[PDB]
């Protein structure tokens, strides 16, 4: 997981 603009996604 990685976080963009405060949400964790794949």
């Amino acid at each position: 997981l990685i976080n963009t603009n405060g949400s964790w996604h794949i």
Epitope: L1, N3, T4, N5, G6, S7, W8, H9, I10
Partner: antibody, heavy 116, light 112 residues
């Protein structure tokens, strides 16, 4: 045993920039964060700069905030412009790893007062 | 925006009892089969220390007396048994929805 430690002036004047530094000792891996606690004890999440150089800021501050790093002084930086008295707080730096996806390790925090 | 509501604000427990703390999100904090809800303990002059991460995994270095659960929007922390060491404020903290926020905290008093 990563250790983090905030430093910077403890007094800033209204309308100026507050600048703080967080030195990391004991290890481009994860998310490097700033958080503060108001004098009445509530905590607010300020932002990070990830391993990639990417940033994420609380939208309630996104206009005045800047977090940067220098990966070869092993240091990272908070800059908050146009401060008022509502910006008085103990400032923390803390890290997030993917081991936990949580603010795992924390500095002792440093106190900053906006006042003339 | 998303608010985390902690209840009670304060709560008193005897030396050996069970403490139970409530965190409610105004909207979900779940993603990819996980809960981005975290719990911290804060003593004065000290920063928050991690207790539970991802809703119910107990942080390394932390006594198995600590545990928590919940999902989606409704989360709780339980200390069992209580020790004197646990006189402190307790926060929940969500890091999967813009803005990241903390609960307004719960303070534990120990009875003696």
């Amino acid at each position: 045993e990563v250790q983090l430690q905030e430093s910077g002036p403890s007094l800033v004047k209204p309308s100026q920039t507050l600048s703080l530094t967080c030195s990391v000792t004991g290890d481009t891996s994860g998310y490097w964060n700033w958080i503060r606690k108001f004098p009445g004890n509530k905590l607010e999440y300020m932002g990070y700069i990830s391993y990639s150089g990417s940033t994420y800021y609380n939208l309630s501050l996104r206009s005045r905030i800047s977090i940067t790093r220098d990966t070869s002084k092993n240091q990272y930086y908070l800059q908050l412009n146009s401060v008022t008295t509502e910006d008085t707080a103990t400032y923390y730096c803390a890290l997030i790893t993917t081991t936990t996806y949580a603010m795992d390790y924390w500095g002792q925090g440093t106190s900053v007062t906006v006042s003339s | 925006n998303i608010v985390l509501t902690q209840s009670p604000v304060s709560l008193a427990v005897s030396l050996g009892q069970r403490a139970t703390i409530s965190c409610r999100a105004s909207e979900s904090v779940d993603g990819y089969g996980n809960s981005f809800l975290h719990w911290f303990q804060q003593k004065p002059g000290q920063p928050p220390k991690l207790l539970i991460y991802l809703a119910s995994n107990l942080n390394s270095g932390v006594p198995a007396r600590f545990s928590g659960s919940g999902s989606r929007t409704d989360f709780t922390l339980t200390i069992d048994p209580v020790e004197a060491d646990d006189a402190a404020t307790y926060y929940c903290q969500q890091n999967n929805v813009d803005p990241w926020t903390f609960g307004g905290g719960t303070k534990l008093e120990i009875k003696r």
